[PDB]
């Protein structure tokens, strides 16, 4: 058959997408028939997944940058505290570092 | 040909997945031919995306809960700060509130 191969090729294309490959070219889009339509569909899935990974990435960088400011300001604030409040400053400093590790872990995961 | 419908049906299944629908059944998996292989493929893509969305949801609930303890402990330490250090206490709570908004905003664009 000649329809056999296009279907097997698109199955492989889905496989690669599933695997996380969002760059691989979707073949057979320029067909007028139902095979061409299935390809175009797969290409819409892919384009959409690529877009969504791209906005996740930029979002991530955004929250990373946006969270540093206040978290840094709080550490700086503990460096202004009086001697009397040293005991509290070290408690706060410890919890800020904790917050940082929690965030940094979660970006590496998401 | 009598292969036409199954192909269109699977193109529709793809469309739904692209749309965000991860629950809709992938038809024609129990076919012995290429069509059944393509379906099974699409089902592996779906299963996997469902799994990723599940991981992400759990992960966020995790971080939201994990952040709350140190943040709350910070706020309570500021409440012990001397009258002298009032100005600093206020700035540290302002910043804790800012962190909460930023995190809460970021959880919301994801799911």
């Amino acid at each position: 058959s000649t329809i056999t191969r296009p279907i097997i090729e698109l199955s492989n294309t889905v496989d690669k997408i599933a695997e996380g490959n969002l760059e691989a070219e979707v073949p057979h889009q320029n067909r007028a028939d139902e095979i061409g339509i299935l390809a175009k569909s797969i290409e819409r899935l892919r384009r959409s997944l690529k877009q969504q990974a791209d906005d996740r990435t930029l979002l991530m960088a955004g929250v990373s940058h946006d969270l540093r400011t206040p978290l840094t300001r709080i550490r700086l604030a503990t460096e202004m505290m009086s001697e009397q409040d040293g005991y509290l400053a070290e408690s706060i400093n410890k919890d800020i570092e904790e917050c940082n590790a929690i965030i940094e872990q979660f970006i590496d995961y998401l």
Side-chain angles (χ1 to χ4, degrees), chain A residues 1-108:
Chain A
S1 180
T2 307
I3 74 125
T4 240
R5 195 143 156 205
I7 304 194
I8 294 310
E9 275 167 23
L10 294 165
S11 179
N12 297 343
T13 293
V14 172
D15 287 328
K16 271 155 168 169
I17 288 152
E19 249 174 2
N21 193 340
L22 306 184
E23 285 90 357
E25 192 80 29
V26 175
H28 309 295
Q29 294 169 53
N30 306 58
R31 284 167 71 120
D33 72 2
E34 71 272 76
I35 298 281
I37 315 203
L38 172 76
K40 275 166 192 150
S41 227
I42 286 165
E43 171 71 5
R44 275 174 265 122
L45 181 47
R46 176 197 118 358
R47 175 101 36 165
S48 157
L49 287 161
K50 168 73 158 153
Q51 175 119 69
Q52 235 169 313
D54 282 333
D55 49 21
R56 231 176 269 113
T57 295
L58 273 139
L59 209 94
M60 297 186 206
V63 66
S64 153
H65 172 60
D66 286 2
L67 279 167
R68 189 138 60 72
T69 304
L71 285 179
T72 302
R73 250 188 333 247
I74 289 166
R75 161 168 79 64
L76 289 166
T78 72
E79 295 176 34
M80 309 230 39
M81 283 169 52
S82 65
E83 167 272 329
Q84 198 150 15
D85 282 344
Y87 78 104
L88 300 166
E90 304 285 355
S91 183
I92 300 165
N93 198 279
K94 181 168 200 274
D95 294 333
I96 282 158
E97 294 180 325
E98 189 168 349
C99 301
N100 259 303
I102 289 164
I103 294 158
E104 174 186 13
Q105 191 160 65
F106 142 83
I107 10 177
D108 295 347

